[PDB]
């Protein structure tokens, strides 16, 4: 046989032609291990080769070097390791020159490079790599690919190793990553890749950020790229700014107000779902981190001593400007409605809750005016939001200021049970339950108890969820009895 048209078939559209050559060219795995890899390493290089051949090329080399399951990986790793220092030094060259000549998109080359990568360095057998890639981007005379392709590699390399191995390559690596994100940089495809690389790298550079010289610099570059026109890179930029926020909360005090708040609070109002999600996550993650510190304080306050680390209270401020987005976002909900998807309607509801449990008795006021103001609106959308928001804000706040609140709505909430809109129903049912779990007393009220239960029952023969919610309620109410004795 002749090795090209086979690779063409090594991934063909038919499950038998492929399954065939997928093994034929697997006999030379354990009976030709070396000799093979190389063969491809060149065909993967010479541009003359049709797409498939090339694409399929690295696919095989990539394949036989690494594994998905963190298990077998160990095995297929030492593989190219215990190999002959003859062909390795050969392949490692027919590939570092394949980039810039591949027309396709996710260029296979990046793949294999990274694969070999997690092994030619955890000991240091390929310490000439990093300087070479660096040259691909920092060098102004390089193809839109020559650059892209490269980064792609750098990114996989990070996404596959434990922090400890890359912690001292940072300076060398990062210097390149960021170069791909710069504003003056032409192709957004290079920018993109780069912004991704960062997402996988932030994880191991406490050293880098600790040096103000760089930090300032990184944050500048990330925020700039947050103003890039290509949606493709904005979602990348925010993802970093979100990761960074969970990662380096303490250092963010110098960027939050001048640069970050304006940026993240803006995004949330993006018509684009992907871009909003990111924005919400940010302030969502911020609460998480902040109310977590909130603990550090007390647990270390009763014991009588300085809190190891201190919060800076961002949610509290922006609270005013947040909610009136979170709430207004509790409207961009999917029609057909999928239950496991992650669209703003959720993030908003979720974050609207977390905030409600960190800011405490400060949220009650900023949210009410939206409920009263949307309990009657025609569009069900602005209606269920009203309910939902009332549902969210029941954790955190002191009951000695909710019990009274609910009661006034409690009644006009029951009427929402059989609200002509199917979504208002479901949500109205969900709240009720949440109003039994959190606040037991203020629910069992004669004034509207009799009219209550008689509507919960009525719900048992309704839609699953709803019914499967009246339970979250009846149950709760009962437990509230075994507790009062």
């Amino acid at each position: 046989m002749e090795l090209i048209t086979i690779l063409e078939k090594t991934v063909s559209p038919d499950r038998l032609e492929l399954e065939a050559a997928q093994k034929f060219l697997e006999r030379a795995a354990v009976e030709n291990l070396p000799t093979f890899l190389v063969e491809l390493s060149r065909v993967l290089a010479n541009p003359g080769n049709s797409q498939v051949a090339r694409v399929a090329a690295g696919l095989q080399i990539k394949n036989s070097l690494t594994s998905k399951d963190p298990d077998i990986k160990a095995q297929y790793q030492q593989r190219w390791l215990a190999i002959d220092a003859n062909a390795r030094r050969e392949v490692k060259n027919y590939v570092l020159q394949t980039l810039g000549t591949e027309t396709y998109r996710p260029s296979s080359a990046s793949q294999c490079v990274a694969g070999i990568a997690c092994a030619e360095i955890p000991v240091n057998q390929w310490p000439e790599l990093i300087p070479q890639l660096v040259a691909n981007v920092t060098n102004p005379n390089s193809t839109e690919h020559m650059k892209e392709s490269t980064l792609e590699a750098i990114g996989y390399i990070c996404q596959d190793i434990d922090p400890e191995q890359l912690q001292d390559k940072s300076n060398e690596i990062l210097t390149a990553i960021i170069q791909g994100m710069r504003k003056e940089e032409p192709s957004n495809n290079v920018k993109l890749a780069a912004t991704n690389a960062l997402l996988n790298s932030l994880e191991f550079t406490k050293a880098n950020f600790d040096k103000e010289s760089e930090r300032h610099f990184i944050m500048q570059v990330v925020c700039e790229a947050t103003q890039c026109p290509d949606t493709r890179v904005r979602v990348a930029a925010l993802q970093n700014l979100v990761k960074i926020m969970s990662l380096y909360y303490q250092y963010m005090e110098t960027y939050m107000g001048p640069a970050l708040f304006a940026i993240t609070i803006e995004a949330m109002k993006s018509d684009i779902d992907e871009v909003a999600l990111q924005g919400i996550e940010f302030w969502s993650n911020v609460c998480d981190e902040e109310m977590d510190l909130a603990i550090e304080a007390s647990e270390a306050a009763e014991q009588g001593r300085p809190p190891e680390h201190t919060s800076k209270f961002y949610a509290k401020g922006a609270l005013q400007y947040l909610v009136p987005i979170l709430t207004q976002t509790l409207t961009k909900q999917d029609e057909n409605d999928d239950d496991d998807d992650w669209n703003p309607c959720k993030a908003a509801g979720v974050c609207l809750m977390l905030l409600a449990t960190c800011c405490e008795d400060d949220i009650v006021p900023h949210v009410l005016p939206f409920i009263k103001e949307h309990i009657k609106n025609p569009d069900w959308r602005y209606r269920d939001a009203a309910v939902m928001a009332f549902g969210c804000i029941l954790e955190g706040p002191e009951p000695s200021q909710l019990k009274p609140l609910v009661i006034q709505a409690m009644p006009t909430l029951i009427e929402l049970m059989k609200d002509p809109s199917v979504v208002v129903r479901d949500t109205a049912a969900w709240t009720v339950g949440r109003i039994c779990e959190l606040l037991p007393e203020a629910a069992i009220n004669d004034v509207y108890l009799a009219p209550l239960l008689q509507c919960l029952i009525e719900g048992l023969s309704a839609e699953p969820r709803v019914a499967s919610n009246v339970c979250w309620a009846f149950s709760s109410l009962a437990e509230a009895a075994y507790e009062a004795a």
């Binding site: 991704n196 993802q239 959720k346």
Partner: peptide, 28 residues
């Protein structure tokens, strides 16, 4: 073809499970 990622998910305390929301979290 299945390249790397786009990852960024969350929902704290019973993460990617869905439903309207979850239950309380308490202390000492």
């Amino acid at each position: 073809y299945l390249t790397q990622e786009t990852n960024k998910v969350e929902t704290y305390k019973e993460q990617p499970l869905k439903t309207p929301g979850k239950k309380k979290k308490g202390k000492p």
